[PDB]
């Protein structure tokens with residue numbers, strides 16, 4: 706898969722993160738990201754995708770070493786960590802055709818896994834609208850503990 710780049714934007718309290726909601730197969734909440742273009746540097750892709758999806762330009766705030774990266778089904782996703790963005794920031798996507806809504810969420814209230822269906826003696830996982838975000842949550846929490854305590 707083509708690598709994806711984007712951002713985990715946090716507010717000034719470090720207790721909220723900015724998620725975006727897509728449509729259709731992307732109908733749930735996830736961090737802003739997208740696919741890298743040919744010859745495009747990771748930081749430039751992250752800023753481009755984040756600005757397309759949120760209308761906020763991270764370019765001046767990216768730190769090269771501050772990111773969480775996961776490989777999910779052999780596609781790499783790297784989200785640069787951007788703390789300290791005020792919650793009164795006006796966010797507006799560039800394309801309403803891809804982004805339904807943009808909201809802040811409490812990090813402590815977000816799930817870090819989906820629930821099984823062991824009460825129903827059935828295999829698999831119950832739907833969760835944070836499914837896109839979930840893989841990053843525990844790594845984010847651990848990262849913020851290490852960097853800030």
Ligand SMILES: OCc1ccnc(NC2CCCCCC2)n1
Nearest residue numbers: 725726727731735736738837838
């Ligand atoms: O959060 C990690 C992740 C994994 C898989 N898909 C996505 N898609 C995001 C960008 C596209 C438009 C809104 C939905 C979120 N995010």
